[PDB]
Design a protein around this ligand. Sequence first.
Ligand SMILES: *C(=O)[C@@H]([C@@H]1NC(C(=O)O)=C(S[C@@H]2CN[C@H](C(=O)N(C)C)C2)[C@@H]1C)[C@@H](C)O
Ligand SMILES: [Co+2]
Ligand SMILES: [Co+2]
Length: 448
Amino acid sequence: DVQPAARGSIVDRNNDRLAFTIEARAAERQDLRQYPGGSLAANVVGGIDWDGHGLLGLEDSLDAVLAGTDGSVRHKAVHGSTVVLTLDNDIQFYVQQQVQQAKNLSGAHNVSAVVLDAKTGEVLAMANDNTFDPSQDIGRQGDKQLGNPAVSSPFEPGSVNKIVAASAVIEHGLSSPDEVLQVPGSIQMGGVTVHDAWEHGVMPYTTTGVFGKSSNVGTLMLSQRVGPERYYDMLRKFGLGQRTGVGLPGESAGLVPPIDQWSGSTFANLPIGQGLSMTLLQMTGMYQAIANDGVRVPPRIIKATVAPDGSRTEEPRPDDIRVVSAQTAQTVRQMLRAVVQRDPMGYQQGTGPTAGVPGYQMAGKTGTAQQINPGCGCYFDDVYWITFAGIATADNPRYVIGIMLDNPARNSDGAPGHSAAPLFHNIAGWLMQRENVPLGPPLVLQAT
Ligand SMILES: *C(=O)[C@@H]([C@@H]1NC(C(=O)O)=C(S[C@@H]2CN[C@H](C(=O)N(C)C)C2)[C@@H]1C)[C@@H](C)O
Ligand SMILES: [Co+2]
Ligand SMILES: [Co+2]
């Protein structure tokens, strides 16, 4: 009497299959969910329950689309639609493997990475270490990552947030890349004292150098020119504190204190990336706005759905959001090249030279942010999120990469330190090579 719907499949942007169903026998007939990639993108895809309905991930959140509706006799069975993701399995597989061995090498508790298409904001890879395998029983995998931290688990971004300040001073005409500043080693601001990560007297950093060397004092001086209201406004335009709408269950909104509630010291913290939280996707989404000539396209991971007859409906495109002008966005991309610039004499070296890839105009930003000690309700001294976000490339934006490491003891490649810059190098360089992308004067970070 019952006519069963056949579960639809989940495929990547090139119709490469991630999840699909085969017919078997046991209550006699029995559908078997196949995951040919094992753990590949399982943070996104999810897994099935014993009854063949989704248990978690997109298998669950899109279950209605994928399961269809059983028929009877007459009511015709509505077979499940196939879901096409924006993911590129080749990119996802490379990125997911690099994330796992950045975790092993660095000693971090967890690692995640997001790659967005620069122009559309489509999610090309989203990965975390320790990803579970939905072809095996989930009750055997308590030691595994079953979820999707890149959207669910916010963190404080540290100096990667300084893209907001850079964008605001350039957009409002308050400074220019070549302005020579005078940056003391510390200032008193809103009742507190902010210090640069290195002791120094007054340095003649250019505005480019303030972000290239990640000077907190320089960042806050420039942020004083912007003001709290224009700064908070730019935070919101970059999409912070708000869900992206990417189409994945468990998305966190992060946390941005609304301006009417700031304490006297909020403005001394937010511009350098403390006192607010965001997900890795929001973080990467900020750099996508600058990559896309100032126009933020909220990221999306559903590309389309295919009906059982074979007809294809594209997912509707989210509306653009103008954050800064194209001229401003191009200026910020060029400035962020200083972060990855090498200088043997040290003077004109950024904080992330290992993130540079010779022959390409890589641009990016390093971050280190203290975490909150759960017992004192205060910051740890020596527990950090490490972050990096960057654009490949400044002159031709194609890819946007965001990375977070939860408290590594070493670099992402295993050398002493605690930088994610080498992970960006690996991924960004590989994206250029695999597409045979073809290959000016040094930037001035520090004047005389
Ligand atoms: C931003 O994350 C903080 C400052 N900017 C940077 C930076 O982007 O590199 C740092 S961390 C810098 C690099 N590694 C040095 C170090 O002493 N360690 C190995 C821990 C210092 C600044 C702290 C901003 C939030 O203060
Ligand atoms: Co009827
Ligand atoms: Co290399």
